[PDB]
Amino acid sequence: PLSELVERGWAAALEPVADQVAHMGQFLRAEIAAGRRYLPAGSNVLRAFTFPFDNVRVLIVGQDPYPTPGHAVGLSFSVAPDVRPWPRSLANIFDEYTADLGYPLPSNGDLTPWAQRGVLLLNRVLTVRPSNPASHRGKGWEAVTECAIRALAARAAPLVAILWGRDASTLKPMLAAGNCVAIESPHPSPLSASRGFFGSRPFSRANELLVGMGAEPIDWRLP
Numbered sequence: 001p002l003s004e005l006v007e008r009g010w011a012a013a014l015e016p017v018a019d020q021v022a023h024m025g026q027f028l029r030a031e032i033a034a035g036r037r038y039l040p041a042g043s044n045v046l047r048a049f050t051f052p053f054d055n056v057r058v059l060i061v062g063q064d065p066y067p068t069p070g071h072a073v074g075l076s077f078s079v080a081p082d083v084r085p086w087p088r089s090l091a092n093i094f095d096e097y098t099a100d101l102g103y104p105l106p107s108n109g110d111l112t113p114w115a116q117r118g119v120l121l122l123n124r125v126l127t128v129r130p131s132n133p134a135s136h137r138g139k140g141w142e143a144v145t146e147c148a149i150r151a152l153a154a155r156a157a158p159l160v161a162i163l164w165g166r167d168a169s170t171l172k173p174m175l176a177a178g179n180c181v182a183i184e185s186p187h188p189s190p191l192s193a194s195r196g197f198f199g200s201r202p203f204s205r206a207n208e209l210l211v212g213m214g215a216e217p218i219d220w221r222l223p
């Protein structure tokens with residue numbers, strides 16, 4: 001029952017895909033029964049939707065959770081506070097963080113503070129088989145996250161989208177079709193590094209766009 005698993009706003013917003021969420025629940029049970037594992041932990045799978053739907057001002061889109069055991073924590077790109085070294089994508093994100101914003105290197109890879117402040121860290125696919133990158137594509141997550149993005153875009157509220165998962169022509173449509181949605185283009189991914197990602201200034205440009213739409217900027221500062 002969605003209201004059990006996600007925040008009040010999110011439970012209402014995701015009502016249309018409530019059965020598909022239940023189905024993914026049956027999928028993950030079937031995987032354990034079949035002797036395959038999944039990440040992140042069951043209690044972290046919908047973690048992105050445990051922060052207030054109404055407060056979201058930025059969407060960061062990834063593709064799939066980290067396939068390495070102990071990395072995936074149910075926020076796109078985030079890792080648990082004791083994870084070191086950081087995955088490549090997150091080191092790349094943090095290099096852009098310091099360059100764009102001028103802040104020092106974060107103390108750890110926990111992006112929880114971004115989530116608390118209205119950054120939706122959403123992966124298109126919300127589970128993965130450990131050590132098998134992108135193993136859960138086409139298992140039914142795509143409809144769920146599409147609806148989430150659709151719902152978010154439909155709010156009479158400012159939204160900036162950052163696309164770090166390369167599915168631009170998949171996602172540009174839903175978003176472009178909302179009232180007050182700005183999409184950061186182009187769509188370099190963290191692993192494209194110095195071929196487009198570094199200097200993309202996603203953070204400062206999100207804040208310029210929010211203030212331009214009469215919204216408060218995000219405080220991007222991590223501890």
Ligand SMILES: O=c1[nH]c(=O)c2[nH]c(=O)[nH]c2[nH]1
Pocket residue numbers: 062063064065066075076077078087089090123164165189
């Ligand atoms: O394209 C991606 N790369 C990652 O390294 C990653 N990590 C994550 O949670 N989502 C994504 N998406």
